Amino acid sequence: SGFRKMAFPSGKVEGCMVQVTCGTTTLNGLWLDDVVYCPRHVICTSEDMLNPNYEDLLIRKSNHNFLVQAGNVQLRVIGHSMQNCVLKLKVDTANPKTPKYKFVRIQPGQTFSVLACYNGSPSGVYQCAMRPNFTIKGSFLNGSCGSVGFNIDYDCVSFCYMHHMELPTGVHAGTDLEGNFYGPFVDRQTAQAAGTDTTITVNVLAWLYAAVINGDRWFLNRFTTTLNDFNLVAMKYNYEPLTQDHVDILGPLSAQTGIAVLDMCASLKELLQNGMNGRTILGSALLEDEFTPFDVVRQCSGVT
Amino acid sequence: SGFRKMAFPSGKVEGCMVQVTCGTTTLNGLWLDDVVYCPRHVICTSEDMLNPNYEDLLIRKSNHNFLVQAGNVQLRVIGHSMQNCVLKLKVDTANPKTPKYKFVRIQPGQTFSVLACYNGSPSGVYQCAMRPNFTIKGSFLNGSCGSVGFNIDYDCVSFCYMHHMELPTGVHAGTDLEGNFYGPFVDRQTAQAAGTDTTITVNVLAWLYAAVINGDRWFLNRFTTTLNDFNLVAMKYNYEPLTQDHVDILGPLSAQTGIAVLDMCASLKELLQNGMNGRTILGSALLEDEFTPFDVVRQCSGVT
Numbered sequence: 352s353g354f355r356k357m358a359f360p361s362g363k364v365e366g367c368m369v370q371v372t373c374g375t376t377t378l379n380g381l382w383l384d385d386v387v388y389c390p391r392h393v394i395c396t397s398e399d400m401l402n403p404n405y406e407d408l409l410i411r412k413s414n415h416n417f418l419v420q421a422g423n424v425q426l427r428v429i430g431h432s433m434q435n436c437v438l439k440l441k442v443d444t445a446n447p448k449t450p451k452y453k454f455v456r457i458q459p460g461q462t463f464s465v466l467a468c469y470n471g472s473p474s475g476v477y478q479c480a481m482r483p484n485f486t487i488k489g490s491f492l493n494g495s496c497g498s499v500g501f502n503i504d505y506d507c508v509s510f511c512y513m514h515h516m517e518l519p520t521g522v523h524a525g526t527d528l529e530g531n532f533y534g535p536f537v538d539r540q541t542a543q544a545a546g547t548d549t550t551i552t553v554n555v556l557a558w559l560y561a562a563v564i565n566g567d568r569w570f571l572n573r574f575t576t577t578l579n580d581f582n583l584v585a586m587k588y589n590y591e592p593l594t595q596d597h598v599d600i601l602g603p604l605s606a607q608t609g610i611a612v613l614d615m616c617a618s619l620k621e622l623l624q625n626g627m628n629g630r631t632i633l634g635s636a637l638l639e640d641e642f643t644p645f646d647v648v649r650q651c652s653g654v655t
Numbered sequence: 656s657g658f659r660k661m662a663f664p665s666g667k668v669e670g671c672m673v674q675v676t677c678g679t680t681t682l683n684g685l686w687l688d689d690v691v692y693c694p695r696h697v698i699c700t701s702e703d704m705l706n707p708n709y710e711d712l713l714i715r716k717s718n719h720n721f722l723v724q725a726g727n728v729q730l731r732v733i734g735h736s737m738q739n740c741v742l743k744l745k746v747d748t749a750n751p752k753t754p755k756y757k758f759v760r761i762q763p764g765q766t767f768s769v770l771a772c773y774n775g776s777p778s779g780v781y782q783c784a785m786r787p788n789f790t791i792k793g794s795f796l797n798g799s800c801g802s803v804g805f806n807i808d809y810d811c812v813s814f815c816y817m818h819h820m821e822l823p824t825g826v827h828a829g830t831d832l833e834g835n836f837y838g839p840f841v842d843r844q845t846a847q848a849a850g851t852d853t854t855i856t857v858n859v860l861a862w863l864y865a866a867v868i869n870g871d872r873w874f875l876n877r878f879t880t881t882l883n884d885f886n887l888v889a890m891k892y893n894y895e896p897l898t899q900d901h902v903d904i905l906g907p908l909s910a911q912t913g914i915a916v917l918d919m920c921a922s923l924k925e926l927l928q929n930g931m932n933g934r935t936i937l938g939s940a941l942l943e944d945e946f947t948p949f950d951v952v953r954q955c956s957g958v959t
């Protein structure tokens with residue numbers, strides 16, 4: 352009973368957080384095995400950030416310039432290398448708290464938990480979605496760079512995001528763990544356009560199924576629709592086009608509730624065209640798109 | 656930039672979760688030092704739950720009937736005792752992962768993180784408020800009993816809640832770590848009235864300050880009010896009466912933003928009487944009451 356914006360337990364990730372300092376800049380690093388991963392802009396001063404030449408800036412640095420501290424233990428840096436926008440610092444000690452892990456590049460619309468950190472210390476954990484425009488609407492202040500996003504399948508942590516930047520609009524941008532930015536962003540203090548965003552349609556439908564499962568059913572109606580008709584409404588309201596792949600992933604929820612996907616699409620169509628009429632769904636007065644169908648199944652079945 | 660419903664990092668609590676089985680009932684326990692804490696209804700069968708005599712049911716049980724398993728390690732039970740609605744199982748081994756901790760009874764309106772667990776395994780973490788009527792609107796399924804709520808001040812975990820029950824209405828009830836229920840609830844399978852709930856006024860005002868800090872300011876107006884006038888509006892909309900103690904706790908946010916508390920109360924008054932007019936505040940289409948003034952300061956300053 353109940354449905355919350357649940358994050359993964361952050362314990363396995365907490366054991367990986369370290370502080371990385373280079374010159375006068377300090378941010379967060381991720382220590383897995385004998386490598387520490389962090390944003391390459393750790394090597395920049397504020398003046399460098401306007402237009403950095405990272406290859407030139409990294410040439411001035413030596414292994415001993417990167418100060419890595421895990422709690423109180425200082426790590427010895429024996430190698431450094433830049434891969435895209437991340438720095439990989441080889442340390443002489445493998446992290447004893449390294450969980451089973453993978454590096455994955457998530458798709459837009461997918462969700463993950465963020466462990467917000469400052470000076471290598473965890474401050475909070477929250478769940479969020481990678482927007483269709485490759486930005487994340489997080490909660491990050493100066494010092495949070497290097498904080499990571501992840502998903503967990505039983506004992507395996509799939510790291511999918513490392514925080515790098517706050518755009519002038521207050522939204523966030525970052526990379527996968529190979530340092531490739533999600534979206535068109537560059538690690539530079541320059542105004543940068545984030546594309547037109549849309550609402551994650553399959554996630555909204557998944558959340559409508561979670562609402563039915565939890566007893567919120569006032570929005571179910573006597574109507575149905577087609578993928579074509581629904582998609583004309585989705586286009587009008589800046590929703591992602593629904594495909595048969597999305598319908599296929601909604602199958603378990605359709606089967607559990609007995610509500611065909613296109614019937615749920617007709618409920619969503621009516622909510623888009625008429626609003627919520629001052630009513631709420633799972634404690635929200637708007638249509639929630641930060642729960643994937645997988646998240647809804649996991650939370651509604653109690654997967655650990 | 657940004658403002659999220661952030662939970663505490665759950666790592667220190669994950670290291671305390673164990674599975675407790677007694678007969679055919681299995682639920683979660685909290686292992687701190689050489690004691691395992693769990694709901695006393697672990698000793699009940701489904702038939703006992705209709706009207707349990709816990710003292711009689713516990714008399715039939717011996718130390719060897721309580722199966723406690725931490726991951727794969729089995730703990731040896733050398734004592735058992737009931738304190739209010741919790742069972743305290745003395746084990747022969749102190750939990751090596753016991754963090755610095757306290758047991759605290761929180762006040763209604765205060766917030767905390769819940770680490771939802773099943774079979775002694777963490778599944779997710781979320782932030783919630785203890786409602787003024789002493790219920791929590793969580794996300795809990797069968798097997799989640801014994802999952803705990805907590806707050807963390809640097810290295811100290813203050814455990815404040817243990818989950819016991821889902822009311823017929825889908826809302827949740829539980830105890831402090833001494834087994835005393837929050838609210839009028841009893842650990843019995845009987846319909847039980849949760850009082851009239853109200854919205855946590857000081858938390859809504861705190862969240863309005865967080866909105867101003869993050870750039871959402873469309874709701875600020877040219878008006879002010881008095882505590883008396885505001886409280887007449889609060890009574891009309893089922894909001895908690897605002898006191899000078901609440902105004903006092905909002906002082907840091909008033910100082911940071913330069914918006915006097917009573918001026919923010921006038922903005923809240925106008926939003927209550929007129930609604931949001933299809934607009935949003937920090938990504939919400941309703942007035943959020945699950946952030947205390949302390950949470951807003953902590954999140955807006957990056958406390959670890």
Ligand SMILES: Cc1ccncc1NC(=O)Cc1cncc(C#N)c1
Pocket residue numbers: 392400491492493494495496515516517518537538539540541656
């Ligand atoms: C103040 C703050 C808050 C949250 N997240 C991030 C920040 N600050 C920054 O973005 C600093 C920065 C500047 N220019 C480019 C990059 C990159 N890549 C990073």
Ligand SMILES: Cc1ccncc1NC(=O)Cc1cncc(C#N)c1
Pocket residue numbers: 352696704795796797798799800819820821822841842843844845
């Ligand atoms: C099914 C479920 C889901 C979430 N939380 C809890 C439950 N189930 C229960 O409450 C089981 C129970 C029954 N009667 C009294 C108590 C107490 N105290 C507990």
